[PDB]
Amino acid sequence: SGLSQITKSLYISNGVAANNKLMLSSNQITMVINVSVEVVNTLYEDIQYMQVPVADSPNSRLCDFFDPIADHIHSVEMKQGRTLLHCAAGVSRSAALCLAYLMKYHAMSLLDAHTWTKSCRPIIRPNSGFWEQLIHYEFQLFGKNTVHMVSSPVGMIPDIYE
C-alpha cells in the first residue's frame, strides 16, 4: 500500500495509502483526487481533497472528467504542489485519469502513456469501457490512435492485452 510516482508531481495509489498521513506528507502530497464513489478520505491538515464519484464500470462516464481533472493536475504542478490520484485499488479508475493526463500534458500517445504508467505501477488495468473512452480521447487529442479495441474470448480488450 504505497504511492506509485508517475511524474514529478503526480502519484497513483490504492485507498489504504491515500489515508496514510505519513506517506502523504513524506511524498509532499498537497492534492488528493479520489476517483471513486465508495472510498472515504480522512481529511488531513494542509492537504486539499476532492472526489470524482464513478464506479469501476465500463458504463461509467469517467471521460467527462478527462479534461477537467487533467487541467487540475497541471494547475497543482504549476503551483509547486503534488497530486495523488487514487481509487479503491489504484488499478482501473485512477489509472485511466492518469493516462488521460499524460496524453494531454506530456505529449504521449495512449500507448506510450500506458507503457510508462504500467512501468511505474505494474498492476494498473483500466476496464474495457475506460479503454474505449481513452481511445476516443486520444483521437480527439491527436487525430490518430495507437491503441485499438479488439475481440477476444473474454470480450473487447485493447490490443495491448493481446
From Swiss-Prot:
<dbReference type="GO" id="GO:0016791">
    <property type="term" value="F:phosphatase activity"/>
</dbReference>
<dbReference type="GO" id="GO:0004722">
    <property type="term" value="F:protein serine/threonine phosphatase activity"/>
</dbReference>
<keyword id="KW-0904">Protein phosphatase</keyword>
<dbReference type="GO" id="GO:0008138">
    <property type="term" value="F:protein tyrosine/serine/threonine phosphatase activity"/>
</dbReference>
<dbReference type="InterPro" id="IPR000387">
    <property type="entry name" value="Tyr_Pase_dom"/>
</dbReference>
<dbReference type="GO" id="GO:0035335">
    <property type="term" value="P:peptidyl-tyrosine dephosphorylation"/>
</dbReference>
<dbReference type="InterPro" id="IPR029021">
    <property type="entry name" value="Prot-tyrosine_phosphatase-like"/>
</dbReference>
<dbReference type="GO" id="GO:0005634">
    <property type="term" value="C:nucleus"/>
</dbReference>
<dbReference type="Pfam" id="PF00782">
    <property type="entry name" value="DSPc"/>
</dbReference>
<comment type="similarity">
    <text>Belongs to the protein-tyrosine phosphatase family. Non-receptor class dual specificity subfamily.</text>
</comment>
<keyword id="KW-0539">Nucleus</keyword>
<dbReference type="GO" id="GO:0017017">
    <property type="term" value="F:MAP kinase tyrosine/serine/threonine phosphatase activity"/>
</dbReference>
<comment type="function">
    <text>Can dephosphorylate single and diphosphorylated synthetic MAPK peptides, with preference for the phosphotyrosine and diphosphorylated forms over phosphothreonine. In vitro, dephosphorylates p-nitrophenyl phosphate (pNPP).</text>
</comment>
<dbReference type="InterPro" id="IPR020420">
    <property type="entry name" value="Atypical_DUSP_subfamB"/>
</dbReference>
<dbReference type="InterPro" id="IPR020422">
    <property type="entry name" value="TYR_PHOSPHATASE_DUAL_dom"/>
</dbReference>
<dbReference type="InterPro" id="IPR000340">
    <property type="entry name" value="Dual-sp_phosphatase_cat-dom"/>
</dbReference>
<keyword id="KW-0378">Hydrolase</keyword>
<feature type="domain" description="Tyrosine-protein phosphatase">
    <location>
        <begin position="2"/>
        <end position="143"/>
    </location>
</feature>
<dbReference type="GO" id="GO:0035970">
    <property type="term" value="P:peptidyl-threonine dephosphorylation"/>
</dbReference>
<keyword id="KW-0999">Mitochondrion inner membrane</keyword>
<keyword id="KW-0963">Cytoplasm</keyword>
<feature type="active site" description="Phosphocysteine intermediate">
    <location>
        <position position="87"/>
    </location>
</feature>
<dbReference type="GO" id="GO:0004725">
    <property type="term" value="F:protein tyrosine phosphatase activity"/>
</dbReference>
<dbReference type="GO" id="GO:0005737">
    <property type="term" value="C:cytoplasm"/>
</dbReference>
<dbReference type="InterPro" id="IPR016130">
    <property type="entry name" value="Tyr_Pase_AS"/>
</dbReference>
<protein>
    <recommendedName>
        <fullName>Dual specificity protein phosphatase 18</fullName>
        <ecNumber>3.1.3.16</ecNumber>
        <ecNumber>3.1.3.48</ecNumber>
    </recommendedName>
</protein>
<dbReference type="GO" id="GO:0016311">
    <property type="term" value="P:dephosphorylation"/>
</dbReference>
<keyword id="KW-0496">Mitochondrion</keyword>
<dbReference type="GO" id="GO:0005654">
    <property type="term" value="C:nucleoplasm"/>
</dbReference>
<keyword id="KW-0472">Membrane</keyword>
<dbReference type="GO" id="GO:0005743">
    <property type="term" value="C:mitochondrial inner membrane"/>
</dbReference>
